[PDB]
Amino acid sequence: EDSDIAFLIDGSGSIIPHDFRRMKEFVSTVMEQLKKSKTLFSLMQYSEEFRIHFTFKEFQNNPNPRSLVKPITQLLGRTHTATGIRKVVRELFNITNGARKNAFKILVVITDGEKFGDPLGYEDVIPEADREGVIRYVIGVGDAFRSEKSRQELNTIASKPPRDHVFQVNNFEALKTIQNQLREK
Amino acid sequence: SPMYSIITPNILRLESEETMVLEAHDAQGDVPVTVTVHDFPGKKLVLSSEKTVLTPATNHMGNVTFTIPANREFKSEKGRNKFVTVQATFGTQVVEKVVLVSLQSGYLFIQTDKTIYTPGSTVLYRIFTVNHKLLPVGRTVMVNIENPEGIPVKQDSLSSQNQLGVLPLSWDIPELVNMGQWKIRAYYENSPQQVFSTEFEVKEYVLPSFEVIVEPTEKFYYIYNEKGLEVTITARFLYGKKVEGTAFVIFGIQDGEQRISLPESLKRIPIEDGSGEVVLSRKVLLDGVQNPRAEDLVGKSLYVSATVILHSGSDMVQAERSGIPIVTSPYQIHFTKTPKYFKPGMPFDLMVFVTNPDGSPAYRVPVAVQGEDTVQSLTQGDGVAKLSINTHPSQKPLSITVRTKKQELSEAEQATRTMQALPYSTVGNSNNYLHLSVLRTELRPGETLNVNFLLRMDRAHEAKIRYYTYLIMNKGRLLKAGRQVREPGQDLVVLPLSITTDFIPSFRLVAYYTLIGASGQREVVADSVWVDVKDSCVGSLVVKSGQSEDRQPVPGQQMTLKIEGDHGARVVLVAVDKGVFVLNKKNKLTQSKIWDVVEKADIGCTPGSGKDYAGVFSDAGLTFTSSSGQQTAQRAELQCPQPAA
Amino acid sequence: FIQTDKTIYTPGSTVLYRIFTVNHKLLPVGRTVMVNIENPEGIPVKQDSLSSQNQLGVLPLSWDIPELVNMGQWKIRAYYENSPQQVFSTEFEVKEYVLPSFEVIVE
Amino acid sequence: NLDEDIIAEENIVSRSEFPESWLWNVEDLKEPPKNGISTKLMNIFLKDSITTWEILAVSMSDKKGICVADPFEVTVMQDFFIDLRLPYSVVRNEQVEIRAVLYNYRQNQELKVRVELLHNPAFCSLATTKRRHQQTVTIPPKSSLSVPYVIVPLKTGLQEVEVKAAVYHHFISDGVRKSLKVVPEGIRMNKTVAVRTLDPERLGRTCNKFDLKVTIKPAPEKNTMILEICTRYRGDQDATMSILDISMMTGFAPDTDDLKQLANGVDRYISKYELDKAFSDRNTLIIYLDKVSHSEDDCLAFKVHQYFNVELIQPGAVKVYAYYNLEESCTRFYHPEKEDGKLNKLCRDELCRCAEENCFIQKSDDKVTLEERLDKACEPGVDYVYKTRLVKVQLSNDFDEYIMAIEQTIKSGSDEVQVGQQRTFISPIKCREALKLEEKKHYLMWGLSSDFWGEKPNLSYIIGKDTWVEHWPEEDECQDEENQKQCQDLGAFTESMVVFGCPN
Amino acid sequence: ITTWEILAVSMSDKKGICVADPFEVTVMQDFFIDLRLPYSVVRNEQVEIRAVLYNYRQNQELKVRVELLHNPAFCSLATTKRRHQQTVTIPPKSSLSVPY
């Protein structure tokens, strides 16, 4: 089977630079320790404006993740989470960027759980990921769990069940649930 | 006093890549620009796309690639038009512009297997989901099967995500059912006011054994034509073998949807080697005259039904040709492809449509404009000549009446049509102009189109214009823009514009230059031209036999099918008995029916130029906004015409 | 052997139905079979004749229920081409209803 | 903007997929067998429907043959959810009722919900585009609440309804999104006169078992009113147990003790729990009757109290039927000023649109300058801006008609208006007095192209949420020093609108 | 025995969409029956029909035996006991129609 892995990081100002560094480094480790067959990686940084830091084509041609992740900055915008997702499903999972049909499609949403200024809601874009069939792993950060409505924003983003998908970034055993879900898949 | 210019479509479609072009004429330094899209009214920042800076290294040009996000905002029942405020900030200067927006996400194309079905049959239909660029998109659609009454008798809600733009469907037709024209309506989830339709007939029938073609020699009836109504009857079996039978032909007249039968006209005619000739004799028609009104008859049409019976006895076929116009004029002239506005003292290029009375083009017809005794021209196979007339430099409205000069026709017959063309108003009527000239011939992707920039002004200013900035608007979007450098003194420059597959089937091209003219005022002159492109697919699809074993097929014979086409492309098939079509051929899917809707979808309103340089952009469907204060008037209507659609 | 997805349907619903063809030794075969869909009146409003070899005795089928249709007890009669007296049946009901939220049991 | 602590409706992924059956699947058993058993594990998705999913299967191997299975049960639910209960055969253009039941299976935690009936242009609801309809409620653990919602099916066919309920100081939200069939009547033959000029210019080349009189009256001495019902049966012999479903005008509750007083009443009974239910969200009441009479009026009445203050109030609803038969029911809606309790809509030959949004664009703001005045006049939406004089007035129950005298066409739009012309502007009856409008007065007015009632030339005008109207006095009525500021901005609005025209 | 139009519709992701020109295909034999059966009929309502033998052989008339088979749901002269046959001679390139 075909392992298509996408990565969506928040860059909003609410992301303190230390949270942000953890994100970039955790992603790079996620890919690194996901060194395994037939896995493809693409990334976009999301805030109030979006910019895909690498596509799948650019990844099959460049396997070194550290080379892909170093140049990434913070955006310091607003937080258009909902809009970011249609940018993931409509662009990253397009055949034009490398997307293969009948592949295991996973989205890694890495944010603190605070959408703001987004004109789009979730009731259009979440059922979209499900009608397209993308299994959504969410990685909350900093104080993504201090508040109540943030952490539920996460389960709102994460596919069900959220206990199996919602994880903190510093936790090192966020991969093994998925690293393993493929070993006989 | 630096000038900042921004340009975008007259209408902004949601969930689609639109482009915005940025230029900074003659302003020093790397110049940053930030554009943001705001609700109208307020500071909602619907979109603020990426950072861009216009460098002298790049001659102060960059563009903005952006897609408008939706926020579920429109109005049902009565429809009010939605708007957004675009905001451009060149460093400190802010240039703002209120733009219309449309919900329409893309296109949807309904294929049924065939045109006509019987009670108890399955209607197989596919639906074709494409974006504004005829590329696959995935949205939910709603499919309704609506009888002649209009009542949905089957409805569904389905998504096209990862179905490659094809939604194979079906619906089973009931034994007890209303006969007539049934519909298939579909529409994207996002944009329901935009309905896509196809009709199909439901009648109790059995396929025949032979087809009958009743076809008159010439497409109309000249009112004084001595020969009368001459018709060639072709009757043949479906495999290509000629039929033996008898024919029964009655005549009738058709007025809009009001039809008047001619019972004395019915004549029985033998069948001669699977072909025939038949005449409505001048002698036949006149006996028992009815509501003759010779002068009045022009403008109506005639229908003729033949009921053909085999010589063996098994199958009878009723065939009919309807819509036969009784003319004084073999033709009709229309100005539908003609610009309404001209550059005074410059050539005026007409695409007059010579039309045969049913709608078909006219082949090898000499035509000319009354007056200008100098020259006459000849119609192509399309019934169109590029009558290029010389304007006299003068601000009188130019009035043109086109007549045909087709030999072997009466001079009264010759078809005529009149229009009036109005001068491009110059700023204070300073009569500094721009003329775009480009040769109008069916342009194929891969051909090079030379673009001619004609500059008209005193020597005081001509050295100032040092490049021209050009723009190609296609299918409702800005496709390419750039600059062609100019050196002081060349009044005319040509851009060898190489034509690509994006340009299909046609496009308009606008362009402009800027300077600081009379009364210290920054001045911009622009001009626009519609260019048609060879109609075809972006890619290509060919079906031929895959067995170099030529032979004619046999019931139950095996066959190998060869499909040649673009790599990775998905191909859906269907094989229909040609015999079906003898009973119905309407709403059959064609590459043509694609393009005809598409061109309807265009936002441009005039084939050419406009009343003034503002009308250029508006008539083309474009917004220009500059830091100086010059910008396009506002567009509040979705449709163009003087009589609305 | 007839499997319908549901036992009761709304006008305008899609009826999904499978037929299992086996001999008296209960083995899947591919053979020619006639399918008759009878309305409450009993009147066969659809028929079809197909063979299942290399469909493994499985005849997956589909029927669109008309919006205007007589409600009541519908049947599915079907038979081998060769043995018409040997007819096998299944019913299914057509009525306008909504799925309930709880059940009621009287004992 | 009172409280910031709820999940936005805009982010409430509803329940979407409710198939009455699915997974018609066909899968093959390729697995290396152990014990003589190939084992297959098909990871799938769980539909947005809360029910136990029964799974039925059949193994057709050519070697052993067919094999039915032991059905499999997958028990699906959430702690807190909704299910929505609708009819099936509803009729377009007829006001109806729905009921939404939120269940709470949390064992010990009560809940406070803000739930919105979601706006739909296919339905005449209380929910305009911009004016939400959010009801706030509280739930006892291991209990569910019935919420009524009366609507008008404005269109035909497969219409979906949505309701999104969000909670406070807790986690989940939910949303129901459920379709059904809407259909037409076709009579349009109500007491027609022989030639009523109903025809257009360009065409052409029901309670049969029950008597039910319900009237809600007011009280003598927050606010309390009387509910009155008056019922009978039409037949040869008296009828069996009849039932009443009664639902509360938004934020209403009956008088707990008069409720008790009535239940001891003859031929009547309401169990204790729906009778000692709490005043917190006591909202829907069911009363069962021993029998009902075919011989005369047996009425009933009792008190209702206002628990929460909102200006606009859903009609109450009362549905009565014999114990055995629901489908031959009779439903009435009540409202004290709305006769027969029906929402205001606007109707022509077979079309209607919902007239229930704010009467006109909100007045009395601190800002009345030219700056905002022009901005709402320079918007593209403004099709027409006129200045007329209130000439005639048709007042009626339904709507109240103001006959306006256009002398000048300031800015025509998609309108072909002649000079010295008389045109019909409408205002709903609920709005009439709020407008403080008098004849003989000039008015400078504006609206949109969408706000035109009819087709040409037998047209009318409608004052909507965003229509702007303002009276214009005479020359002898603006010379006052007090009235300067108004007539100042009137003169400068006009001239700069006139001279400059519209900007674009 | 006729001529089919086969239509191919294709869409790639980048090469847009293309409905190709039709492809005709001609089912035609030397000798065959055209069998002229109504859409429906009424039960117990007698009519005739026609089975038209097409002798599209080149240069030889054709002595054929024309025949029907036994459906006990119809009353014709054919049985398993006694059949219902003519014996007919067809010139080349012609259409002989047998009544039943």
Ligand SMILES: *[C@@H]1O[C@H](CO)[C@@H](O[C@@H]2O[C@H](CO)[C@@H](O[C@H]3O[C@H](CO)[C@@H](O)[C@H](O)[C@@H]3O)[C@H](O)[C@H]2NC(C)=O)[C@H](O)[C@H]1NC(C)=O
């Ligand atoms: C907006 O900017 C885009 C990139 O900044 C630009 O895209 C470029 O579009 C041109 C179209 O002319 C393409 O140019 C050439 O591509 C190949 C290159 O070998 C040639 O064979 C062609 O003939 C063609 O001239 C670029 O490939 C394309 N590049 C990218 C990265 O998109 C848009 O054209 C710009 N549009 C506007 C309106 O400014």
Ligand SMILES: *[C@@H]1O[C@H](CO)[C@@H](O)[C@H](O)[C@H]1NC(C)=O
């Ligand atoms: C019939 O007339 C009454 C008023 O007399 C009105 O309330 C009702 O809406 C009308 N019904 C129809 C179907 O027009």
Ligand SMILES: [K+]
């Ligand atoms: K045939």
Ligand SMILES: [K+]
């Ligand atoms: K249920």
Ligand SMILES: [Mg+2]
């Ligand atoms: Mg932030």
